[PDB]
């Protein structure tokens, strides 16, 4: 049968038979298998980032065309989210945390992985905040996570790509989502189950967060010993009172060809008046770019195998970015600006190798309003004991790198705007603004 009324987006909910299968283990006979994760102190083996690529680059493979139009569904309810997301309007760099960009898809995911530990009302909630309406209360119209999770593990692998490049790609997107729980806080298996859908890199492990300042800075040492790159703190504006602490970090690695890192800087001005002494990228190439004139725009981009895009947003004057900027948030037009006009163009723009840390519940609110739904009672499915979130953070560690008659003189001079984009995942991974590097 056909029911897609109310929302189109019919691959990311719940089947009957589906849920039929689900009716059958919804009894209470079963009792799921619970477990207290080790103390940080335990040694615990960094994450290979090799085997990770070439093992998110085999799911990416071994996909269905099915499975690729869920990956850039899921991809869309991620940009959506992300624009509903500028609601806040423009204070979402108020959540001054390092450098100032958020990842769509990394927000979405963190916020659906929360939907596996959801009940009634609280699953109910959220369900409307990642994006999928629904109506009558049942099973059929509610949001299918164990989906939802490995459509958006998909979606990674297909940034990740370079299928007619085969030869490595020199783009890398790691995610690994650190779950510390407080002691004696028995966490149910079949949650831990789903967030391996979302990303191998599972790392629930206990922590004494009766003392914040020694949790902090412990919670530091591990993830920068598992992981291996510097994340902007951990553990910020989280209370004393807390037990949960659901942290995804991601890293972005993005090679571009045709670019080399100059020893002489170029310098930027943040604004008219103050200058800033900073390095830089010169990039020759013909790429495409296309100014609209109406609103005064610019953007021009350096590809990753096509699949995945740099676009690099330019204001035309480079006066108002928030208006401007605005523009780059804005529903369906970011995403249709797409006219394909190529260019011989004179790509110059600063360095970028900068951190940053936002936390969702202060990411998110008053539309939304989740950080009273997350320090409410209902969660059940994650939670055996109580529950209680300090913090549910997203950190980002976003890096560009190069690979050694007419023309347009593109210079990055002033502030502007960027956002990477998938078009096989229909996603957009990162969106940011830059002031000045620091």
């Known amino acids: 049968s056909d029911r897609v009324y109310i929302h189109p987006f019919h691959l990311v909910i719940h089947n009957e038979s589906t849920c039929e299968q689900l009716a059958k283990a919804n009894a209470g006979k079963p009792k799921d298998p619970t477990f207290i994760p080790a103390p940080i102190q335990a040694k615990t083996s960094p994450v290979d980032e090799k085997a990770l690529q070439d093992q998110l680059v085999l799911v990416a493979a071994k996909l269905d065309t099915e499975d690729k139009l869920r990956a850039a569904m899921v991809g869309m309810l991620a940009n959506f989210l ?111 189950q789903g967030l391996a859908l979302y990303t191998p890199v599972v790392l629930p492990r206990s922590l004494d967060f009766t003392e914040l300042d020694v949790a902090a ?97 330019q204001p035309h004057y480079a006066s108002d970015l928030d208006k401007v900027e605005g523009l780059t948030f804005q529903q369906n037009s970011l995403n249709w600006m797409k006219k394909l006009s190529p260019r011989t163009i004179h790509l110059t723009m600063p360095q970028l190798v900068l951190q940053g840390s936002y936390d969702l519940q202060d990411l998110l609110a008053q539309a939304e309003l989740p950080a009273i739904l997350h320090t409410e009672l209902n969660l059940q499915k994650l939670s055996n004991d109580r529950i209680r979130v300090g913090e549910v953070l997203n950190s980002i560690f976003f890096e560009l790198e190069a690979d050694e008659p007419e023309v347009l003189e593109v210079t990055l001079n002033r502030p502007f705007l960027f956002a990477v984009y998938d078009q096989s995942a229909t996603a957009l991974h990162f969106l940011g603004r830059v002031a000045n590097p620091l």
């Not at 991601?250 to 890192?261: A, D, R």
């Open 82 to 192: 992300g624009f509903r997301i500028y609601g806040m309007h423009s204070e979402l760099w108020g959540v001054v945390h390092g450098a100032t960009v958020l990842s769509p898809t990394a927000v979405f995911g963190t916020l659906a992985s929360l939907y596996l530990g959801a009940l009634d009302h609280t699953a109910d909630r959220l369900q409307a905040i990642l994006g999928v309406p629904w109506k009558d209360k049942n099973c059929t119209s509610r949001l299918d996570a164990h989906k939802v999770l490995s459509a958006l593990q998909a979606v990674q692998g297909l940034l990740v790509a370079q299928g007619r490049a085969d030869s490595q790609a020199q783009l890398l997107l790691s995610t690994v989502v650190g779950v510390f729980t407080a002691p004696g806080l028995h966490l149910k298996q079949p949650f831990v």
């Open 217 to 313: 800075e412990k919670i530091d040492r591990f993830m920068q010993a598992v992981t291996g790159w510097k994340t902007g703190c951990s553990l910020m504006g989280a209370s004393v009172d807390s037990t949960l602490a659901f942290n995804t970090y991601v890293h972005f690695q993005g090679k571009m060809k045709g670019f080399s890192l100059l020893a002489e800087p170029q310098e930027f001005w943040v604004d008219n008046s103050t200058s800033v002494s900073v390095p830089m990228l010169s990039g020759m190439g013909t790429f495409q770019h296309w100014s609209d004139i109406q609103d005064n725009f610019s953007v021009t981009q350096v590809p990753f195998t096509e699949s995945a895009c740099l676009l690099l947003i």
